[PDB]
Symmetry: C3
């Protein structure tokens, strides 16, 4: 029937004919095609967004994504603890919902459960069925979780969860979400998150990185496309004033991004970026900033050195610091804007060679693992595959040495930000001029922007050790200047 179909659907024809899924019948993935043909457009075929469908001919990539492993140091690692990645989180994000719960990332099959379950998502509404003994279960979101209802309370929770959230945890809304979550789809940015979640059965789909119609490498994330289109020539994935991406737009409803070849920097940047997906405040005007605003589904693709002036180049911030009152950027996982322009990036290395390395599955067949690898934990396949002369110790030595040097500056950045913050509050009480407290607000704004980036970022400098050193020394520098002048004012008050 395929020629019948292609009559009103030529983008699928253009993707699929002469592709590597050429021979796959429209019926392996779309149900009720007959009722579509026989009573027309009105009756849509059913497209069950499902890794198992891809799995039936790609068992390795399917079983590797779903394999359960137990890190014996456990999961749900709060960042905010003394020996954690963000030891002065509570002080430095005072005001922000990340103060309720922010844990370290774990495996991809858990991304839906984990966002819905975290204390900051929806007031603790959603919970693991059977609780802790079932924290390692993978598969279907609502086989794993229960919903204790709209009116349930859990103490020391928050209500950060929103529709745009879901776009970096599932390919489930790919046909039910119009571009940037403007209206006209099943869901949009203004939708109740508690409607949206019951539609989310799967983590990141096979379809997120790989065209089902043609097996092309690709991207579906709306905000990323918006960003690769705002800057096709000078964006972090660009080359020669051009990017290996061509947008296909359906009905003016949705868009995909076929790259002529693999750039896992782009597949991975669909979620491993800094992003605004939340309500905010305006810098100029002080007005709230709403889900009706398209800055609430937004990929800046700026690094640590650029992000402050970007969020000023859009009169956008996330939150006032509960003490200093400074208009702060909330930073999240910028692995893409970090990795950009680094040693490995420069050398043509992409996320997949370190994070999805080659393994012998089947009975003796080669593939890329789709359970993403933590490389310190797999130096032979993550590092020595390329660095042929490296011993496991040397590989580990390198990752940890860079981590050590970076974390040293991260930790000092925090010492100074804590010092600014406390110094600010002493200034206020010693009555210090409110004109100056502004000046200091800008210094906390700067010092925070060049620090929080790196706790938000997951590599402790490995992804870009020069950018991390220039950033974090930047932060230390802004805080000392900020504490200097506050301290200067607090003697002048008394002079």
């Amino acid at each position: 029937g395929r020629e019948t179909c292609y009559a009103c659907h030529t983008e699928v024809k253009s993707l699929k004919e002469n592709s590597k899924h050429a021979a796959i019948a429209c019926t392996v993935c779309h149900d009720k095609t007959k009722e579509h043909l026989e009573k027309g457009p009105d009756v849509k075929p059913v497209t069950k967004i499902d890794q198992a469908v891809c799995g039936s001919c790609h068992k390795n990539q399917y079983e590797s994504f779903y394999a359960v492993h137990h890190d014996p140091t456990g999961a749900r690692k709060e960042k905010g603890i003394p020996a954690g990645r963000s030891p002065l989180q509570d002080k430095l994000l005072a005001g922000h919902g990340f103060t309720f719960e922010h844990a370290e990332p774990r495996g991809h099959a858990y991304m839906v459960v984990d966002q819905f379950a975290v204390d900051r998502f929806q007031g603790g509404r959603y919970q693991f069925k059977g609780g802790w003994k079932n924290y390692d279960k993978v598969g279907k979101t609502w086989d794993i979780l229960e919903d204790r209802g709209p009116n349930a309370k859990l103490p020391e929770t928050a209500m950060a969860g929103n529709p745009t959230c879901i776009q970096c945890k599932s390919s489930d809304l790919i046909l039910q979400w119009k571009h940037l979550g403007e209206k006209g789809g099943k869901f949009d940015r203004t939708s109740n998150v508690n409607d949206v979640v019951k539609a989310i059965n799967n983590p990141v789909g096979c379809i997120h990185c790989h065209d089902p119609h043609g097996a092309q490498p690709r991207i579906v994330r709306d905000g990323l496309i918006a960003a690769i289109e705002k800057d096709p020539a000078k964006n972090i994935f660009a080359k020669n004033g051009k990017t290996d991406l061509k947008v296909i737009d359906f009905r003016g409803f949705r868009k995909i991004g076929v790259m002529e070849k693999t750039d896992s920097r782009m597949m991975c940047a669909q979620c491993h970026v800094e992003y605004n997906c939340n309500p905010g405040t305006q810098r100029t005007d002080g007005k709230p900033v709403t889900f009706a605003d398209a800055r609430t589904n937004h990929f800046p693709l700026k690094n640590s050195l650029q992000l402050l002036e970007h969020y000023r180049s859009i009169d956008f911030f996330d939150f006032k610091h509960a003490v200093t009152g400074a208009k702060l950027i909330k930073f999240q996982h910028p692995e893409a804007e970090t990795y950009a322009g680094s040693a490995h990036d420069k050398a043509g290395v992409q996320c997949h060679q370190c994070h999805m390395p080659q393994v012998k599955g089947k009975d003796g067949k080669k593939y890329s693992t789709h359970g993403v690898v933590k490389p310190i934990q797999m130096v032979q396949e993550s590092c020595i595959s390329c660095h042929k002369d490296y011993t496991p110790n040397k590989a580990k030595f390198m990752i940890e040495t860079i981590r050590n040097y970076t974390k040293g500056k991260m930790r000092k950045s925090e010492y100074w930000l804590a010092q600014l913050i406390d110094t600010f509050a002493v200034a206020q009480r010693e009555g210090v001029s409110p004109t100056i407290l502004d000046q200091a607000r800008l210094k906390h704004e700067e010092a925070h922007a060049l620090w929080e980036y790196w706790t938000a970022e997951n590599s402790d400098g490995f992804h870009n050790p020069e950018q991390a050193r220039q950033s974090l020394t930047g932060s230390i520098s802004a805080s000392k200047a900020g504490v200097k002048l506050l301290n200067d004012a607090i003697m002048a008050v008394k002079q």
Copy 2:
């Protein structure tokens, strides 16, 4: 010629005849039996309370108890280090003798030696003979420790040691201590602790948990007996409006509580509980609770959510905080009260099944290891014995995720207690008043009770993950309210 004795010791007759300890001559465990008959009861037989008699017949329980293990991470682990179980100890407990030293617990054979030598015990009077190189020595207290004498001074120590303290470190005084440490025996609660220590040759006797005459499961601790006797139907060890304790009293002098079935929850709540074995202060009068008072040898047998009310009820608190003056409860190792009502306790699982798992000896009869275990360190016997589907990685994952989540809240609640103490110092200097300060001081009590319980308790929430989260979020919420009504009042002044 037992019936001769039985003629006169009838409670002993009842425990011993038809029992597993039927055939044992009285002489085996008592000496001087002739002068007692021949001279009369003025001349008491000697009762050398000693593991090694039990060891003659029970070698695998004796060996495993005294077996010397070295953990390569060491012990004398101070809980008030940055990466410790209680990193904010010195600040949250200020005024408390625990600020002098509080280590993590080690194995049961060290318990007298570590009680005697701790910096908080008796001004450093008692030290390991030959110093650090003998810190792993097991055996008789005074073979291991030396007495520096009463006039020895050692910097930065405390004098928390009293008689009652020994009641959770050894069986040696079982016949030298009237019920509750009331005046009557060789030692009471008013005895000089320096006379008491010379009488303690062994750690916890075999007879602590086991009747010497018939071998029936028992408790000997006068606190634990007393608590249960009080709350006979509803206490944390009950089932169906009663408790499994057959309570035998000897000469109206002392008592054992005997059980038809092994209940290790009770066997361990002889020591692993919250207690008061110390002087304190009445909440109403400000005046002393000396060792005169029965509240200085007291088991609440209540959990985190009940203890502030319990001790409020019996007009008792432990120390004013050094900054805030809050009438605080000092919390100690409430494992039995935390475990009460958890998923494992509801399964009917007891302390012993995780902490004394089935092992085999030289020949290989199956014994319960009396070298108690750290389950994370032996997940095959402690976990996988019962959870048959768990791998070691799985068992480790289940322990550490739960400790991870719980620790995240413990660290957050310590951040909020320190902020609460810090803003109180400020509110004093900012001239807010006894009324606003007495209310904030009330928020310190509550959030101290709902936190310290958990640094006191040794599971980091494994024993009761739901209780922990309820309590620690409660603590956070209380500190948050406290801080709210300080900084508010701090503006009320200068407005």
Copy 3:
């Protein structure tokens, strides 16, 4: 024929003649001798300071010195991080150059390159050629390091570097440096540090500890030799009111001291000591002590309990604490003075017995490893080799128990110092008399000297657990007494 040489070089003959080296011709280690012979004394021979030559007949000492090792925890471990050796470094050293960077030690082969590349040396001017990927490279300094230039800057760096630093990283200047760096040689204390770094291709040479001429155990370190000569009956290496060491003063220009027997406390003592090698400030007048003053190249040879007196007595302190203006001593790695009169010292054990344990070559010859060892990593032959009853884990438990107890005190000293500095600052800002801030400042001095000795020393109390206890408790005491004088003096103002 070496007899010509000897006629004008008396003291070389006396070292070489009838030694294990005697037969080795002068031309093995000296070029331009035929030129020296003909063209007079005006043509000084070439003697290249070069481990390769010592190497040629001392294979296994050489190869072990240069052997690549990769610690899987990496290197460049900042000490001022929460989990780290000196968590409160940034607060307690506020106003000293170590706040810019201070990492744990690695291998000797790295000593010059880490000295010149550390952020606190010369404004980030020296960096690894090819960056992090070459950070494990050994051998020649200017093979591994690039000079970025005098004009270049790197943010948040310091300029602590000076020629005297090089005396504890290299032997290369043993024929180029007046005794103690006084004026006369190609390099002296007043030299531009960047001229001196050009001359240093090698770390500590074989000649640091072994006489090239007759292979006698010696020290070549000017300021140690000077320390001893000054206090020859009562210094730390003395027995019987005599040190084992004849000082040989060649041309009145350069001293060495030769050993009758191997004393590694002395040899290792050439670097593993507290020193002054930096400008500071006289206490009596507050006047600078510049490189003109011989106190800028100075070995006290005093333990934690003597240094405060010592620096008062020679009228000198390094820096003012940024907050308290306390006249603070900067401590560095006081290892041999820590070790002096410890249980191991008094038992005649030497540094080399633990740190250069016997291992054997491939050819199968036994030797002392010159890749200096971290005992916890290698207890088999740093410990068990002497303590044969010791299991691997007992050796670890022993090291780690001592470290555990000491760091418990160390962190408490740090908590109380931070309390003192936050109280000194409150106290100031509530306007307590300068006389009573002066009282506070002396306690800060005393607290400080008793605490920072142990963060700079490398063992966390293992080397001398008794001295560490008595010093750190002395610190806590000094701090608490300060905190009390400030809180009482605070209440006095507003009385």
